[PDB]
Amino acid sequence: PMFIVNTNVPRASVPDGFLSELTQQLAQATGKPPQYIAVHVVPDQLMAFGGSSEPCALCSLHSIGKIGGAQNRSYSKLLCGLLAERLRISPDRVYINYYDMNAANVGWNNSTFALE
Amino acid sequence: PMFIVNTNVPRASVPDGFLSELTQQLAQATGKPPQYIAVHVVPDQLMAFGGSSEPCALCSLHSIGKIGGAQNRSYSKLLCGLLAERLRISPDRVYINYYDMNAANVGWNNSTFAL
Amino acid sequence: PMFIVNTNVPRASVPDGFLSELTQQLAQATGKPPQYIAVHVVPDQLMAFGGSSEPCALCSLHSIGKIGGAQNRSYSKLLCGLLAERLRISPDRVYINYYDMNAANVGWNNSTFA
Ligand SMILES: NS(=O)(=O)c1nc2ccc(O)cc2s1
Numbered sequence: 281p282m283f284i285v286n287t288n289v290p291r292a293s294v295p296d297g298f299l300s301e302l303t304q305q306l307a308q309a310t311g312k313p314p315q316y317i318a319v320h321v322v323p324d325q326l327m328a329f330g331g332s333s334e335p336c337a338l339c340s341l342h343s344i345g346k347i348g349g350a351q352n353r354s355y356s357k358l359l360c361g362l363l364a365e366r367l368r369i370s371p372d373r374v375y376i377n378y379y380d381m382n383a384a385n386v387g388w389n390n391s392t393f394a395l396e
Numbered sequence: 397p398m399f400i401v402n403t404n405v406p407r408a409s410v411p412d413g414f415l416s417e418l419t420q421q422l423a424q425a426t427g428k429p430p431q432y433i434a435v436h437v438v439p440d441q442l443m444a445f446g447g448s449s450e451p452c453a454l455c456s457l458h459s460i461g462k463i464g465g466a467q468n469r470s471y472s473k474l475l476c477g478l479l480a481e482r483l484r485i486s487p488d489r490v491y492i493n494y495y496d497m498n499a500a501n502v503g504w505n506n507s508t509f510a511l
Numbered sequence: 512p513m514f515i516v517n518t519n520v521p522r523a524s525v526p527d528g529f530l531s532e533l534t535q536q537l538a539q540a541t542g543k544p545p546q547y548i549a550v551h552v553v554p555d556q557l558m559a560f561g562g563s564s565e566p567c568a569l570c571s572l573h574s575i576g577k578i579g580g581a582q583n584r585s586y587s588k589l590l591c592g593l594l595a596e597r598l599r600i601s602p603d604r605v606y607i608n609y610y611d612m613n614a615a616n617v618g619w620n621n622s623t624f625a
């Protein structure tokens with residue numbers, strides 16, 4: 281999948297190894313090779329959650345399949361856990377948007393994933 | 397809802413209290429508690445609208461329901477209004493992408509809104 | 512269309528003319544007037560692709576129509592070509608999310624396109 285995290289937590293507070301941990305945990309959680317996983321972390325953002333500028337995160341996870349009720353709840357537990365532990369963001373100040381992408385709507389390497 | 401604004405307007409030109417005003421106006425516009433509202437403003441961006449780098453904004457509004465023809469037109473009038481008044485961005489240089497999210501596809505507090 | 516590029520390539524490596532080239536090529540590829548096209552480039556990003564921090568890009572393209580199997584493959588060839596030539600990013604380290612937007616879900620100029 282592609283996972284993006286936007287947060288008002290300062291860049292200095294993002295630990296060494298964070299992108300690599302996200303990559304590995306996402307591979308494990310989805311049962312996919314890490315070569316497919318893209319991660320993007322955007323600190324120092326001007327944002328508010330519930331009208332408060334305390335630490336928060338707005339996130340997106342895109343995947344061709346592997347998106348659904350139980351799976352998404354599991355991703356949320358995993359990702360909120362990591363954001364709490366590594367960035368000290370409270371899970372109730374995190375939103376994650378999940379997108380189930382069609383293969384034909386995902387570009388890569390000069391084409392898309394619809395080759396049929 | 398979740399509202400994101402990306403703009404080439406300078407950070408200094410974003411007034412104090414802008415995030416609070418967005419939170420308040422969105423709460424009122426959608427008839428929802430402000431505790432649910434997330435807002436995100438990203439200034440100083442490298443962007444062009446119609447080939448020009450005069451002030452512009454690219455935005456998104458995500459909501460679980462409360463998205464639709466008439467509602468979106470009302471949101472657009474409101475949000476373009478705020479961007480024009482507060483950030484001095486012309487309404488014809490604003491795009492807003494609206495998304496009607498399923499509760500099962502929105503994560504929060506270690507779970508989703510599908511319980 | 513609206514096209515967004517997020518990349519870990521440094522700001523200084525984005526050439527003069529890049530936004531304008533993207534604007535013109537997107538107009539040509541979609542047949543849309545350039546007046547409609549919005550482009551946004553975000554350099555110096557903290558990202559990884561396949562666990563590596565070599566140059567990469569995560570992109571999105573939104574359009575009211577003009578989205579589909581063959582068209583998206585054509586856009587990918589075009590855009591990966593530009594990112595490779597201009598930003599020195601390898602095409603196999605680019606992801607692009609395509610969105611076919613309903614006109615009622617796109618706001619502009621105090622209203623929507625519906
Ligand atoms: N099936 S998978 O390896 O998890 C992937 N899904 C997406 C979705 C969007 C996207 O831009 C990239 C990918 S990779």
Ligand SMILES: NS(=O)(=O)c1nc2ccc(O)cc2s1
Pocket residue numbers: 375376377397398426428432433458459460461462497502503
């Ligand atoms: N029903 S509501 O309070 O307006 C909400 N909708 C969304 C959608 C996405 C999202 O990430 C967060 C929320 S809160």
Ligand SMILES: NS(=O)(=O)c1nc2ccc(O)cc2s1
Pocket residue numbers: 491492493512513541543547548573574575576577612617618
């Ligand atoms: N028909 S078109 O000129 O290519 C456009 N489509 C969109 C979609 C979303 C959006 O935010 C803006 C535009 S312009």
